[PDB]
């Protein structure tokens, strides 16, 4: 009768299936308490730990849940028995930056933020220290309210506060040196009788600071490049273009805007090639998600001019 829909903070809502395991995504949206303005920003994904797939409005979530091992087998080289899929509320990857940039809906801001925060904290955002220090300061206000000196002034910025305001990939070596500027800026949000108190203004300010990160809004895919030397990669694909991360470190390897690179289908459906326009070099990415990536690149580039 019912099914869990998660948000990227890990919370979830219970929904009623009008047509049982035949219930569509579109129905489910309407199944929850949501308008077609609100539904403009997100849809349903199905994700297990190592594969996330955006659903069409006419797909049937539960059957994809049922059919996951073969989906996994079609799309990845994972062991099927070690992944459990769940349904998620997450950003529509087609959502143009320009349209998002006008978002005023509290609910949408929240879904979008919980997702941005997850991405920030896991290391999928590369941005300079200044940017990271700003976001951390916003997280402090959001999670702990006004700066209050009695508790903080440094000594209450222990690696476990920190853990929750900076990317996990910066937290052992970079961020211990940012702790002063983080508190300074945190003091200014609380001290600012001009910048708004409210939970959705902070969340929105948070998204504002994310909008320029190159990988913002990307859907990730896993893959490999053969420089015997194999580099495991996340392929990021977004409204701005194509991005490769190291799977281990999250180090950004390359970022390419639509127009400054072209792609070719591999000889088989399990790889694709990227030719640099300026660097005049080529590389191949191996991943059984090749067809996905390539269609998302055609579709998102076409959303331009």
């Amino acid at each position: 009768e019912k099914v869990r829909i998660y948000r990227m903070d890990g919370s979830y809502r219970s929904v009623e299936l009008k047509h049982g395991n035949n219930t569509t995504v579109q129905q489910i949206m309407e199944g929850m308490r949501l308008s077609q303005e609100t539904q403009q920003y997100f849809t349903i994904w199905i994700c297990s730990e190592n594969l996330s797939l955006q659903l069409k409005p006419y797909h049937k979530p539960l059957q994809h849940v049922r059919d996951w091992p073969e989906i996994l087998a079609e799309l990845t080289n994972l062991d099927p028995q070690r992944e459990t899929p769940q349904l998620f509320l997450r950003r529509d990857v087609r959502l143009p930056l320009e349209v998002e940039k006008q978002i005023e809906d509290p609910l949408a801001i929240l879904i979008l933020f919980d997702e941005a925060r997850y991405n920030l904290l896991k290391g999928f955002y590369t941005a300079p220290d200044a940017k990271l220090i700003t976001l951390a300061s916003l997280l402090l206000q959001i999670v702990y309210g006004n700066y209050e000196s009695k508790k903080h002034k440094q000594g209450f910025l222990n690696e476990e506060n920190l853990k929750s305001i900076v990317p996990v990939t910066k937290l052992k070596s970079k961020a211990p040196h940012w702790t002063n500027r983080i508190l300074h800026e945190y003091k200014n949000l609380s001290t600012s009788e001009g910048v708004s108190k409210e939970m959705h203004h902070l969340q929105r300010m948070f998204l504002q600071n994310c909008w320029e990160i190159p990988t913002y809004g990307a859907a990730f895919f896993t893959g490999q490049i053969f420089t015997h030397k194999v580099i495991p990669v996340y392929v990021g694909v977004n409204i701005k273009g194509l991005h490769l991360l190291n799977m281990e470190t999250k180090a950004l390897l390359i970022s390419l805007k639509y127009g400054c690179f072209m792609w070719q289908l591999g000889d088989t459906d399990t790889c694709f090639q990227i030719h640099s326009m300026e660097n005049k070099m080529s590389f191949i990415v191996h991943t059984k998600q090749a067809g996905l990536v390539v269609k998302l690149l055609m579709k998102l580039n076409g959303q331009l001019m």
């Binding site: 797939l53 955006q54 659903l55 069409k56 006419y58 797909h59 059957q63 994809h64 989906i71 079609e74 990857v93 087609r94 859907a219 996905l292 269609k295 998302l296 579709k299």
Partner: peptide, 7 residues
């Protein structure tokens, strides 16, 4: 055709 086109 339909059940395998994501995104």
């Amino acid at each position: 055709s339909r059940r395998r086109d994501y995104f």
